[PDB]
Design a protein around this ligand. Structure first.
Ligand SMILES: [Zn+2]
Lengths: 48, 53, 24, 146, 1110, 95
């Protein structure tokens, strides 16, 4: 996003900066589960 | 969570061939020419006809 | 369903009239 | 493309007539058991139903031929018998599979080796073992490395 | 505030709230009231400007009516639904295991036209489950919640995709109804337009156009500006309207040649008949808004039409053509763009009412089929409506919905907050929606439209991420099913306290400013530029002149649970999610206490949860007791409230209520007069405030571990009551009826010492695992004992008992006190299942203390297992001698980005010890923004710091530096929030000061009592001879594939072999190994696992010759 | 056992199938509804697939381990452990 989050967690993010951080938070949390799958795939094939 | 059982029960006895039931084998022949054997006890009374394999 | 083959095959014979049954 | 199969049958000595069955085997009962649950309600595997169909349509055929019914009936009976055997071996290879009770397909023999559930996929995923347990962990700083 | 009984919790808020938090349970109660058409909803709809509103059930009955048999010789019409008083009370329904329901009655007008007769009488349509006050359904004794379902709304959805094959932007459109078949159009890469009906093979659009009767001239006239349709028409071989039907008909009926009448009427029946196609009153609205058709009136029609289909096709063509604005003859101009299916302007919310209504409609459809079938085969002019209306299918559908539907979930009674957040949960899965293993990432990612409607923080952390969420605090559900949110209207730079509830799609037409933007005393914006949201979801600065709406309050975007966390800004979203989720897992403690530092929500969330007891009418408390409270109202009426004592919740947590009023005290209406489990004085209390010191300590708090003072075990600070239920039923068998008796074969007299005359365990007796709870025996039948047993029984001569013991026993690893027994007997005409004779339920209660391994957590997403409980003297203590209750590791805070816990720790100490700002020569600069109420406060003073309007970083330093002296006259904590702790073991003071404060910590319900397993030998499965586990005692652990890889990598052969053969599957080898261990002999070699032999038998059964040879 | 050198899979002819079986299934019934016993020639017959109870005959004439391997002359059920029902196979000669 072209607008940075100029407030540190010590200062306290405003409402909208906190709202936009949730996009990345949710993306990572939802991604990790599928992310492990590719590593498992490669490990299975390498072992086989 | 739920339990069941087969149509029978188990027995824990141990003994082996040291006990022998006196038995003898009868011989049968079928229509197509195949032949078969059937062990019966020495009480015999062997039947004249038998349903083979 | 694949019962249609039987229906087709039995469909090639015409029904009997009242006088053909006695003859048969 | 044809020569591969033709030579495969040309080799090993074994005849190709095995592709036509004059008799079919029956799996032992306990691999397709009938068990009465607590309360008297019975549970049964699908296999002992598929086999039943094959036993029915066969017997009727052996009856139908005896009285010399017209070919229009005998051939339909033979078609039914072959379809029943095909469903027994691989249900769904014909088309829409047989369902029986409910609206679920009946598991054929091949289905016990094909899908995720089976003795070729589920067997390699290990087995549950005795003499084992599970528990949460806490940090023991006084422990030695062993 | 309105709530009379609020404890005085001073607040740091600086912004005045113009809108009061709505009823948090309205989403359920309002929907259900709409379903049954209660008079309150009917009056409210009129107050909203509506005319002649119809309830949900009235709508279904009107849709069903009139039942007309073909040839039109008679008709039937249902109408006027009525509800009588509920059969039984909620408490009685729970106690006796019934369903809380009310009888339903309707009138049925039967008309015989061939003779002109009319008949009617009341018809009993069955028991209808009723939503109890506070929003739950009692089904078969259990308490259930129907979760609202988030589903994509019916309508027209245009989409565009660029294809690298030719780099062209192809376009497609889908029209999705609430009922009936589907329809879609697409533009191929070959410059042609195609049509697909019911997902059939692609066909040209001209076929559909000519099916409706269109010809060359009309297509040229209307669509002549587009080349693609002209090319498709040129390529198409269709000539004449009937020719299109000729092509269409045979596709669905391969073997039947078409006939003109049926072929022509097929299209009308398929789409243009409300009998088989329906937009369900919402797709109509969306299509009218999008295409600009039929706007300005409440169209009763819900079927597809000729004008709208051609309008959709033209819209697609123009969108491909490149138009940005479009107009329709007889319509209004609309913009041209593709539709985002994730926007809440497109996704609606099926509430409980609609979910029940759908199943009612299905049941009545089956009833209609039966009635229309059977009305052809009964005496005419002598039939009666009550003699052919069959109510079985509708009752069956209602029973199935509440029983098996994925939405009707068990009430989550872990604590009041868990239940409150479960009621207003939104689920994207279930029938008619998505599924867990599908939909990828797109459906579950956050979207700018979620602001103020669905909380982005609170959501399950497992595989259901994003698929399940929580409704916002201020959000309300539109009648059509959309989510509305309130905004303040601002005119030309000055705000105005007129609040409008805007839906998702209407918000994009305006620019909305932040709630915290400063304003003059008159309401005018004081800044020149303000930070606002834009129509595309971006956030940008904008001149104050251009703003037209404003947020109601900073808390608008957060849910109920997320609003509980103080200093929410200083916690990253990843940890804020964990903090919100953990609060739903806190168990109720023996005595709950409200947090020192909290949020203003803590009050309302407690009252709206329905767990507390509130006075219905103003009056004076007349009599108070642990069991009931009697209040005399000012109007002369007397009310009595019964307090549920030690009732078992769904998850085994105790649900004790206690009074907080004294005889003679006057109470205003709505005042809290009794706390629930996790509440104190009406405020929610999920955990405990206790003294925390932030420092590593001898490695016992290493890797998120926690150290507790033994005081918490001595004084029952974290003790909780747990209640379990054990049930046993006596039925009949072919050998006779099994019976419940005190005497049972071969048991020591001591074992049956605590058994009643009827064989039940005496109430109040202490029970330990393996003890008898209910003595039961079953007929044995044939024995044919073995010769050794025969000889032994001759040695003592004991009888061969005709019965075998099957008594109910306490499971392994359980103990407690028997606090109650509930018994059902068929001899008393109970509702026991078929073939059952007796049922006994015994409740066992235990008093769990905090111990090693119990998980503790805070409100900021920091949790850990208790690694060590040390004696009080070993804990570090302040210079005044006070020991610290808990020690937390330092290394876990900075890297997890949850620094808000440190802020909470400081503010907790500020609250515990009063403060007094030294206002001697004017207020200090840092305190200039503080309210006058916060200048001073006594010890043990609770404070409130809202989630987005709380104390600033600069005020905390001043409050820390102005803390009052302790008991002895000295300050324990410096301005930096640190104290000189003393080491309890060596006595020497620690070299450096350590941060100390008061933190609110929760006892999570994740006790491993159901996760600790051990098994030497136990049950084995019938089908596969391997051990079972995870659902019974002595479960076996699963040795997975990766563990086998590790075994092979170690080069470990024998261990793997014994794991896979002896311990698991070798039926013959298990007993041999057991006897070898028992007798002290070395273990024999393994055998062939049953798996391999079954594999060979299975392959042989499939006509494969498989054999092993050497 | 466990000295296996290789495992081979090949086509099975009618002769092999007929050799594996201990008898053919001539009727479709499985178990009687009243006495819950395997039927005479059904899919669960004890004469084909072995006894239901250890070292016990279907008719109860032989119920002692001394009779191991004995075929009951009355009904043909073999006296052996019930575990054999996981190994014994049948076949269906179809017209
Ligand atoms: Zn016998």
């Amino acid at each position: 996003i072209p607008r940075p989050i100029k407030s540190s967690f010590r200062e306290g993010l405003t409402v909208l900066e906190y709202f936009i951080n949730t996009h990345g938070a949710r993306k990572g949390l939802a991604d990790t589960a599928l992310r492990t799958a590719d590593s498992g795939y490669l490990t299975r094939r390498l072992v086989d | 969570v739920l339990r069941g059982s087969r149509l029978g029960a188990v027995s824990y006895e141990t003994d082996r061939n040291h006990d022998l039931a006196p038995r003898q084998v009868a011989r049968y022949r079928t229509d197509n020419g195949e032949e078969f054997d059937v062990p019966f006890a020495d009480d015999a009374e062997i039947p004249g006809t038998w349903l083979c394999r | 369903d694949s019962v249609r083959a039987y229906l087709k095959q039995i469909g090639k014979v015409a029904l009997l009239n009242a006088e053909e049954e006695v003859e048969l | 493309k044809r020569l591969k199969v033709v030579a495969a049958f040309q080799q090993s000595g074994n005849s190709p007539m095995g592709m036509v069955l004059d008799a079919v085997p029956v799996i032992p009962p306990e691999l397709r058991p009938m068990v009465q649950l607590d309360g008297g309600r019975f549970a049964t595997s699908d296999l002992n139903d598929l086999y039943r169909r094959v036993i029915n349509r066969n017997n009727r055929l052996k009856r139908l031929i005896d009285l010399g019914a017209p070919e229009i009936i005998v051939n339909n009976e033979k078609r039914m018998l072959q379809e029943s055997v095909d469903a027994l071996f691989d249900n769904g290879r014909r088309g829409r599979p047989v369902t029986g009770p409910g609206n679920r397909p009946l598991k054929s023999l091949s289905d016990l080796l094909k899908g995720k559930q089976g003795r070729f996929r589920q067997n390699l995923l290990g087995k549950r073992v005795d003499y084992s347990g599970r528990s949460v962990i806490v940090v023991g700083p006084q422990l030695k490395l062993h | 505030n309105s709530v009379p009984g609020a404890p005085n919790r001073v607040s740091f808020a600086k912004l005045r709230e113009p809108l009061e938090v709505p009823g948090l349970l309205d989403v359920q109660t309002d929907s259900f009231e709409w379903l049954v058409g209660s008079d309150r909803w009917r009056q409210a709809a009129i107050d909203r400007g509506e005319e002649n509103p119809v309830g949900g059930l009235e709508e279904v009955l009107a849709e069903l009516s009139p039942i007309e048999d073909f040839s039109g010789s008679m008709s039937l019409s249902f109408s006027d639904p009525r509800f009588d008083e509920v059969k039984a009370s909620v408490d009685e329904c729970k106690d006796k295991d019934m369903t809380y329901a009310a009888p339903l009655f309707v009138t049925a007008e039967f008309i015989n036209n061939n003779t002109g007769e009319i008949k009617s009488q009341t018809v009993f349509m069955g028991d209808f489950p009723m939503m109890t006050e506070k929003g739950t359904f009692i089904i078969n004794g259990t308490e259930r919640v129907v979760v609202s379902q988030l589903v994509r709304s019916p309508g027209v959805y245009f989409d565009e995709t660029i294809d690298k094959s030719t780099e062209k932007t192809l376009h497609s459109v889908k029209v999705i109804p609430g009922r009936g078949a589907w329809l879609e159009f697409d533009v191929d890469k070959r410059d042609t337009v195609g049509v697909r009906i019911d997902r059939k093979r692609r066909q040209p659009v001209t076929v559909l156009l000519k099916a409706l009767g269109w010809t060359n001239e009309q297509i040229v006239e209307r669509f002549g500006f587009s080349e693609i349709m002209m090319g498709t028409l040129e390529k198409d071989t269709t000539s004449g309207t009937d020719e299109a039907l000729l092509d269409i008909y045979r596709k669905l009926r391969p073997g039947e040649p078409p006939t003109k009448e049926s072929a022509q009427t097929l299209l009308e029946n398929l789409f243009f008949k409300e009998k088989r196609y329906d937009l369900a009153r919402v797709g109509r609205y969306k299509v009218n808004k999008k295409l600009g058709l039929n706007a300005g009136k409440p169209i009763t029609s819900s079927t597809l039409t000729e004008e709208d289909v051609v309008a959709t096709i033209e819209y697609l063509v123009r969108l491909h053509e490149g138009q940005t604005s479009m107009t329709v003859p007889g319509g209004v101009e609309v913009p041209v763009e593709v539709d985002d299916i994730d926007h809440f302007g497109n996704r609606r919310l099926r509430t409980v009412g609609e979910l029940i209504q759908n199943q009612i409609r299905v049941g009545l459809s089956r009833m209609e089929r039966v009635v229309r079938e059977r009305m052809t085969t009964q005496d005419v002019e002598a039939i009666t409506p009550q003699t052919l209306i069959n109510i079985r299918p509708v009752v069956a559908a209602i029973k199935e919905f509440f029983g098996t539907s994925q939405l009707s979930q068990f009430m989550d009674q872990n604590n009041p907050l868990s239940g409150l957040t479960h009621k207003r949960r939104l689920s994207a899965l279930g029938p008619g929606g998505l599924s867990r293993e599908r939909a990828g990432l797109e459906v579950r990612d956050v979207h700018p439209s979620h602001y103020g409607r669905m909380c982005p923080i609170e959501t399950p952390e497992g595989p259901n991420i994003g698929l399940i969420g929580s409704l916002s605090v201020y959000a309300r559900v539109n009648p059509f099913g959309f989510i509305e949110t309130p905004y303040r209207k601002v005119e030309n730079g000055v705000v105005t306290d007129q609040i409008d509830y805007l839906t998702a799609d209407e918000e994009d037409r305006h620019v909305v400013a932040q709630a915290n933007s400063p304003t003059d005393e008159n309401g005018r914006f004081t800044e020149d530029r303000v930070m606002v949201r834009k129509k595309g979801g971006e956030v940008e600065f904008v001149s104050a002149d251009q703003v037209d709406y404003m947020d109601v309050s900073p808390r608008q975007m957060v849910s109920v649970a997320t609003a509980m966390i103080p200093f929410l800004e200083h916690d990253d979203a990843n940890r804020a999610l964990m903090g919100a989720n953990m609060q739903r897992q806190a168990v109720p403690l023996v005595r709950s206490e409200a947090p020192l530092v909290g949020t203003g929500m803590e009050l309302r969330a407690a009252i709206d949860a329905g767990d507390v007891v509130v006075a219905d009418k103003t009056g004076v408390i007349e009599e108070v007791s642990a069991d009931y409270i009697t209040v005399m109202a000012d109007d002369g009426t007397r009310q009595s409230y019964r307090l549920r004592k030690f009732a078992r919740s769904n998850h085994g947590t105790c649900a004790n209520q206690r009074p907080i009023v004294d005889a003679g005290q006057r109470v205003e209406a709505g005042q809290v007069i009794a706390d629930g489990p996790c509440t104190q004085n009406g405020e929610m209390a999920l955990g405990k405030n206790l003294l925390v010191a932030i420092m590593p300590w001898e490695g016992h708090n290493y890797e998120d571990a926690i150290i507790l003072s033994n005081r918490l075990v001595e004084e029952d600070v974290l003790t909780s009551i747990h209640i379990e239920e054990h049930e046993i039923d006596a039925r009949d068998t072919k050998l006779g009826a099994e019976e419940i008796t005190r005497d049972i074969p071969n048991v020591s007299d001591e074992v049956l010492a605590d058994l009643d005359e009827r064989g039940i365990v005496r109430i109040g007796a202490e029970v330990r695992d393996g003890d008898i709870l209910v003595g039961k025996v079953t007929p044995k039948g044939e024995t044919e004992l073995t010769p050794e047993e025969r000889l032994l029984r001759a040695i003592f001569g004991e009888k061969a008992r005709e019965v075998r013991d099957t008594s109910l026993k306490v499971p392994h690893g359980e103990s407690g006190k028997v606090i109650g027994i509930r018994v059902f007997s068929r001899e008393d005409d109970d509702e026991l299942p078929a073939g059952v004779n007796e049922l006994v339920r015994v409740y066992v209660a235990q008093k769990r203390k905090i111990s090693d391994g119990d998980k503790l957590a805070g409100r900021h997403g920091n949790k850990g297992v208790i690694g060590k409980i040390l004696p009080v003297e070993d804990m570090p203590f302040l210079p005044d001698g006070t020991p610290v209750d808990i020690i937390l590791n330092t290394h876990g805070v900075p890297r997890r980005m949850n620094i808000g816990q440190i802020l909470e720790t400081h503010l907790g100490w500020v609250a515990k010890a009063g403060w007094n700002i030294d206002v001697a020569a004017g207020v200090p600069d840092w305190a200039s923004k503080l309210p006058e109420e916060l200048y001073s406060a006594p010890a043990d003073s609770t404070v409130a710091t809202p989630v987005f309007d709380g104390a600033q970083e600069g005020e905390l330093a001043g409050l820390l530096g102005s803390t009052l002296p302790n008991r002895d006259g000295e300050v324990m904590v410096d301005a930096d929030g640190k104290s000189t702790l003393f080491d309890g073991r060596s006595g020497e003071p620690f070299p450096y000061p350590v941060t100390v404060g008061y933190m609110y910590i929760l006892k999570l319900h994740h006790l491993v009592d159901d996760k600790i397993h051990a098994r030497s030998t136990g049950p084995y499965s019938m089908i596969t001879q391997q051990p079972l586990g995870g659902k019974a005692q002595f479960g076996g652990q699963r040795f997975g594939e990766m563990e086998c890889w590790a075994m092979q990598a170690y080069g470990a052969a024998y261990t793997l072999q014994e794991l896979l053969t002896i311990k698991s599957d070798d039926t013959v080898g298990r007993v041999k190994v057991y006897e070898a261990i028992v007798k002290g002999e070395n273990i024999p070699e393994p055998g062939i696992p049953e798996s391999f032999k079954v594999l060979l038998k299975e392959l042989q059964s499939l006509c494969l010759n498989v054999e092993v040879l050497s | 056992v466990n000295f296996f050198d290789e495992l081979r899979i090949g086509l099975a002819t009618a002769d092999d199938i007929r050799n594996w079986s201990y008898g053919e299934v001539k009727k479709p019934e499985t178990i009687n509804y009243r006495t819950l016993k395997p039927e005479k020639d059904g899919l669960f017959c004890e004469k084909i697939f072995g006894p239901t109870r250890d070292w016990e005959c279907y008719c109860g004439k032989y119920k002692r381990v001394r009779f191991k391997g004995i075929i009951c002359e009355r009904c043909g059920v073999e006296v052996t452990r019930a575990k054999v029902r996981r190994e014994r196979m049948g076949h269906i000669e179809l017209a």
